[model samples]
Target chain A: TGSKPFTVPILTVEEMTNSRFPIPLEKLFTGPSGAFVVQPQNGRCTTDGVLLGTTQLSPVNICTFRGDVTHIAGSRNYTMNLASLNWNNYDPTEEIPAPLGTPDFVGKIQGLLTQTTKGDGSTRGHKATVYTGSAPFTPKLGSVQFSTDTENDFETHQNTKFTPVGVIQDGSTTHRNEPQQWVLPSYSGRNVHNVHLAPAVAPTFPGEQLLFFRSTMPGCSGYPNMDLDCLLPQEWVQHFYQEAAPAQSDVALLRFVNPDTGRVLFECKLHKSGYVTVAHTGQHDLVIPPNGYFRFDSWVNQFYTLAPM
Target chain B: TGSKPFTVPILTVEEMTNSRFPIPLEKLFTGPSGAFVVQPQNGRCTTDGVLLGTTQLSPVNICTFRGDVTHIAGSRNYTMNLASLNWNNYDPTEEIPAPLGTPDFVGKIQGLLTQTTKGDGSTRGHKATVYTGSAPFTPKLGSVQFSTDTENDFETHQNTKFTPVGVIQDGSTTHRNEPQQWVLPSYSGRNVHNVHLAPAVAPTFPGEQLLFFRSTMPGCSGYPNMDLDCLLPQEWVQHFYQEAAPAQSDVALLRFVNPDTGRVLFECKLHKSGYVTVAHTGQHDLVIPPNGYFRFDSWVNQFYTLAPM
Candidate 1:
């Protein structure tokens, strides 16, 4: 059984009637290539049909490769040697396959952490070939420091504090060292950026809140140059007068009141910015108009950092 | 049985021993007062003893009033007659009775609401007598406003919109018409001032934010009076250069950076208040140090009102 060559035996009429592989008289004969080839009947092949051929076959309709197949074309660098493989696989009518049914190709790749040298001759843990789906994949880092220079301070046992100089784009050979040159990796068919710095963490302390104020009617003049009077407006003074008359009436008690307390919190005076007297007093008061009023600037016009309580 | 007054018959020996209210011989004699009274044993009436007295009989103990008792003291405004009903009854050895076990007398009173005239001459629903066990009670009303004048715009089916003038005190007759005189109700036995207005709500549009800027050095001088060159500091320029140079150097391209954006938000120039120069440009830039930094004021400098967003 191991040494003998074999061929199909001729079948009698009764034997052929009982067999499913009964070939037609034409297919029974071998082609010029010395291989028995069967053509599809009316351009169709049954599930159990078998065919074989050599040399060039006009078009064998469809071919399926169940296992890994390499070099299906010639390796020669010639015109007809199939220089590249181009497949038109996408279809307008096709819907993206559900994640459950699609192959887990991304999950199959092994992620890696590689050691790479930074521009300043410092070593860093370079994340390599990591595909964690479309979600962000942050490495477990306690804290990271940015350095202005490439020398990694945390590497040696010397300086542990360093300003960040630059960030490198994923899959790019260029080193981003210039200030404000950070670029994120191209995001295609993904929900997240490949290489994006986390949104700037909110201020570590009492953060900034948006605030607004309107200036007085007589718009402030003598600005950047400051050749004219620089009478700036500060906090506002809500004065209760015995009567609204004579700007300098004795009964006209002037004071700045706390909006929260409803009490006179500070003493104030009406000063002339340009013949128009404006209330100008108190630490919070920075500028005030002549005929109008102003507001008290707490953190404004001064050095103040809102710290969390 | 209905027509005649009746008395129990006296008993002797074994008969008296069987009776629960058998009076001794002394109790049989009426002591001035016509009605017979019971006294305890050993100069006091026991459960089975009886006694009676009148005129200057002296002391008696224990009286109970089951229903509402009004003015148990003098009514004529006369000196004597225990002018007031005052009782100091408390346990020195025991803490105040647990609120859970004590009678809920406070909760029994029906709360009340009354109509009152506000300083603005507007009639508003006033929450008068609300008992919350000595706790402050806020009226069940939405936002309220005070008016500057006594016109009562909300009164004569006329001025529907009016500026709030003052807030009402919990228990006061004088209207707090003065600006910033809004008062809150009193809090019992607390160190904090109860009648405090809420902190002024900031302008809602583009609300308040904490911004900072470092000033140029030397020092700004002749402030309030404005004697020196008050080209005041407003904003700065951020220049990317190799070295930190003089206050005004080609390398020191200083620009005012918004603390939030870290970008130039305003145009400012260095000005000399005394010998040094600083950033002074926009009206919002109120003050700048001769050799330091400052911040652009938002709500602090100008006539402003803090309304809830």
Candidate 2:
């Protein structure tokens, strides 16, 4: 429901549309004052003043600005817009009045968002910065402005192709700044950084609390330890936004049940808990609580498994 | 180059068509008496008396009866037919008249070959037989008949779901017997057992001989050592005729160019070496001879890498 805080995408109009990623449809609900308008791909934010963008219930990427969201639906189609401009605004979660199936994002993000990278920023954005630079690559956002202007860590003794991009922008910023175009043989899933991996600290028992952000890659082709995407595929954290959201089309639900009695104990889901900094995106995870048993709804996107304890 | 003794498919007509895989086109060349006809799908071997099926030059599969192959080209298309019926026959490699690119098999084989398995036969076919059965799920070949009639290993004392299929046929037999149909989300490469790995026996020096068949799967996604396709993808072994051959499309040429001196240091290629029982398919490899250095052509289809040792 629109009232349930959504992890939103914050980006310029041109970047979002040109990239052509579909807006997350589940959050927005348009009605009498029915606010689902994007100035249709060109014009501007509808009279309601909102960027036509996507949202995530099942936490896709980490936050540029982690906060609340308001999902609004409309006729013809639907949209997931930010609750406000500052992005720090809050909206308490509201119960949806048992409406029939919310409008969902359809189709994959086709041929858009050409990459403009040197294998730096996107990988460094979410982690505790062991390094930040100031060689300058043009500023985009305010927080990043601090890094580019003050955190001059580029050109350090790290000499060996060590000329880092001035300030590593978070996935939210990358989604906004990177050029958008299609390329041959560029399957997004096949890209080096998107393989979802189980946390290094696997849960042997269901009632085990897990902090997914504190994970590492087991190392597959082209992936090494220090690699951020190795911890979680970039798409899982890249396109996301406190800044921008994702399809949320693919969801994950860890519902704990009594294996002995087949009764529910506690539940944690991407839609609800995914917005928190400790939980959502590769930088975060839905910090599932300690429980007795758990069941998952979507396992396709996550390359994780648990041993039956 | 009409005679290298291609591994050939030897099933009855209807079976081949019902399964409807493409005939390897890199083997046969049509002539005035030209034998490049499959009797048009439903038709029998032409006056050329060759089955309309595909062939492999780079060893896509193992030998149910691998011996030799003949490369022939025709007008509309080319064909790779066996040199004979018994499959134990031989053909000498002949030099070509320095022609243009050989007529290649084009396009991916789409919507064909549904799996009909117990996950036992194909996996068992290549390795030195750890076990064979006789519950008799209908015999298709003579060698298999030997097992179906003589080896009754089903219903053994191994009683935990131990009703094994009566005859673990080789890749060749499975290709001939399995059903063919399209299914959703079945990306052949994504299918398990297709990933290639460097041999467990790694070579630190360039002047080393490698027996690829001796390699094993590093084991990713649904694969364990006991898996046959684990040695190589089933397509690299299955569908092959003594068996079948591969596209010869994605070719692997181990060119031994002198890294320091920059001169040719002798070479091995899939076209010639991949035809041997010890060299083609996952059941076999190109069996490169000891050389100073080597380079590969197609790395995409193969999930392998060299450590620069």
Candidate 3:
């Protein structure tokens, strides 16, 4: 499913600084065919034009540029080898992809070209900014990020500390950026946040609806205001997500039939409704509607019900 | 630690009927040493004297002698030989231990005895009631029982369904025979009840007992109602037993040696108190007596003091 449209709150530079690494700016380069390339200091660079030396950058050329050129300071006779020069141009649409695990940056700046000058005074520059990756990059480890799935919160741990990484603020919004704290011990293979409750709103029931027990014993119907309807455990929500996509099939149908008469009381579904801001269990059940009469015999039902003579 | 004296409520016969096995009363006998032995019908009966038959019962002896025997009704004055007979007696101190997982019982009605008319007409009897086990027996697989320890509630399962077995009701006494119910999913190797909250009583601090924070940042201490002496998250009663015992050592000292001078606060402990009916967290802290003082320092602590007239 596609993600709902939303904007992550902009973080200050100080907030981003603690958890990010600075990419070395000296590795920036312009390809002869006008594409920008950014390799780390130790990595090899690719060339699309006539070989300068070998494509492998040695310690000397890694910093200083060397090429075939002749220069005289005072004697100005116009002699220029135009065919040997290759010009690199910049296009915004041609930004390269950034390195993996680069936090918060789409790509390196690709517009500024590298500049060089000889004693003859011919100078040049290429686009300095390179856009190497898609926008809204993958978050760095220990940095905050929104959950890709809105049905549930996301969590991770650092050391033995249990961190609930995100909280569903409402239906689609998840709040991150809280200070991390240690939580209780937990079993392996179970995510603690999946069991932690987000807030819940009690469902309202209409007066016309009558709830009932799925199974009955001798004295079940005698208790007033005691109905069998209840909130399913968090494991039920966990099980549904483990089996299928929670967003599409968050609904669960509870079919109740009276065993004595084999008559269906009601076939009702529990689901996440728009009435709630977000679902913790993802199954919000309201009043249960009666599908058949509880008492099969009119005489038994009438004896309990007072009728005017 | 000695357990506090408590009583387990009596369960009605219907409650005990669901999860118990009935022991047949016919195979009971008396040993020459005078102890009662109860063997089920198929089990071997112990003999204290010369065996009339093999100690191992045969298939016919296991059943046919179990049928009714009769004698002539009018023999008024015939002498009978009864010197070899040993009668069974009931002594509470000599009661044999009950079998494991026996259901509850009030007492044994002890009059019936085994009688056999071996064409010669011999009869014998033995003690019927033996109190080998302690009162309130251990519950069977699906039956309910009280927790021997009061730190938390006991729990078990009914046919793969998890049930919290009992609760401690604090009144004149703690009652322990409520029907168990399904509670929640929990990690193994840790008691779910112990990890869960019992009841909590908020600590009360006196105005004269000035609270101070252990370590302070610039803006932390000036809030009107906020005190530095408030508990840390790990210091909460939940985290104490939830992580480790709060009872043993819950006190954390914040020591501060004077750069020039300082003042002192109270030193005390949080532990099981005799006042409350019980401590759910097992630590009910009260006001600590003043072991030290808030300073009347002239210089080191003078800046925050009101100016002298």
Candidate 4:
């Protein structure tokens, strides 16, 4: 305890590894003064803790143009640049592992769903879609939410719909009850982005894609908070996987294109600082494979209790 | 020899491997004599004779889609299906193995700059595009001439250009070409494909995407008689790699969207027959990388040599 400001020691990936002696989730909350010690013979112990410790601390930082706030559709002169890229792993079939961090992630637009939440408190509830991965890691047991508020708005019962687009990663909004679901018109088999042409061949329905940004569309409320969408240069920072840090640091880039024309979109200079909820199943749109969910869940469960200690 | 018509013996992949020596591309012109044979000491060998075997004769059959085929750029209602896939080698970054039986295999779009001549004085041209794992591959490639004989007919080109929004598929024909480097007008990033929304995401594009057929698009006709723009889904055949086919083959399927309004414009299906151009320059756009160009050549070369071999 301190009369002044108290800051927990920033642990390094190495330190994090040594500390794991069959650690329990509860030990996370207990500070170093009363920190729980790992018994000599706990469960499995290895350098993996070091690997896990290296996990990103906050949203990754990305350096790229953030589109002028709220440009009307077709108003701004948008041009996507096509950049040739080489995959770290090339598979003739099957999805490959996602690149390691933010900005490296390819962002796209999935259609919008409608949700209505009223003060009337009538049975009419908000329509929400908790976002999960767009193209890879499917059949996940994604999270659920029908409320805009990550805080009080959604506890486990009644909640708001999905957060409106444009506010997923600004300031403290996401940590708080940012919009849980987005609302607007609907679409099908739409890709907010067009990149490699091979993955998309023949005729694919509801193809490999991601959720697009919502600009001046109808029925859009929560916006301007997290303006991750960039119009012209069709590029952004994919800050999903990166090393943890007090300030967002270390980054990567990803690119996509509109081959029919020749517009290109890419994200780069990403630093870790923001976060996207892995699972938000409350929304009907979230479709995760029943079996794969638990396995993916295990990757995250370990951190459920990692609070600064 | 008997006077009656004789059947040619088709060579299995295994049989070919066990034969005496290597077979030349021209060997396909022979009859049952084209079968592979063991030359005692060496490896596999091909005998020179008359009447080549049928495509199916050898567990592998090669079918070619040539001439004015339209590369549809509209919505795709298809599925991702692939049988098997194999890279030329193990380098994750290496481009797919050079397509067998083709020279100038590294280029696409069949440009006049690298035209190969035939026995006659006339010239043959083609355009190729390699879709390695990238998004621009969203669009389709292949030429469509209103009539096989129409040479640069302005009317047909214009008609094909103003194609009403609809799903166009393989085997579908519309307009024809006039033939002298028949270049068609192209829509830029400024003009995006408009899709209807409702059943899903409401999509609208403001920039960085265009809807067009690959066959007629600029930079696509560099290779003569090949549709490089059509990203081929990778597959495994005994000729390349010998592995039992899977009961349930997996392929890549994807959709593209307009970030401006969240509308789904096009969907793509990458099958075992589809793959991307890799291990080349990072430069994208009108100038494709070397690896990409080579893939285009694979088919175009074959198209020119074995038009009916």
Model 4 ranges with Cα > 4 A deviation: A1-127, A131-219, A229-309, B1-309
lDDT of 4 by residue, A268-301 (tens): 1111221111111121222212111010111222
Which digits, one per residue and each the tens of the lDDT, describe model 1 over residues A1-309?
Answer: 231221111221111110000011111110121121111111111111111110010111001000111111222110101010011122212221111011111211111111212232222221112222322221111111111112221232211111000012222222221111112211222443222111211111123221112111100101111011111110010010101122222111223344454554333222211001212221122222211222322211112332211
CA RMSD (A), model 3:
39.6
i-RMS for every candidate:
52.1, 24.7, 44.5, 28.2
- Fill in the DockQ of model 2: 0.01
Alpha-carbon TM-score of each model against the true structure: 0.11, 0.17, 0.16, 0.17
Write the residue-wise lDDT of candidate 3 on B114-140 in tens digits. Answer: 232223222222111111122322111
lDDT of 2 by residue, B248-277 (tens): 432244444454566654433332213211
DockQ leader: 2
lDDT of 4 by residue, B188-271 (tens): 111332121101111021221111112211111111222212111111122112122221222222333344545433332212
Question: How far off is residue A109 in model 4, in Å?
Answer: 11
- The list of candidate 3 runs beyond 4 A from truth reads A1-199, A202-230, A245-254, A272-309, B1-309
Number of clashes in every candidate structure? 69, 54, 20, 153
Summing lDDT over every window of 10 consecutive residues in candidate 4 chain A, give the lowest-scoring window.
A22-31
Candidate 2 per-residue lDDT over residues A1-309, each given as its tens digit: 342222322221111111111111111111111121111111111111222222221111112122121112221111112222122332322222101011111111110010111232111110011111222111111111111111222222111111110012233232222111111111112232211111122222233223222221111011112111111211222223212323333234444455566665444333222311112122222222222333443322222332221
True interface contacts reproduced by each model, as a fraction?
A: 0.00, 0.00, 0.00, 0.00
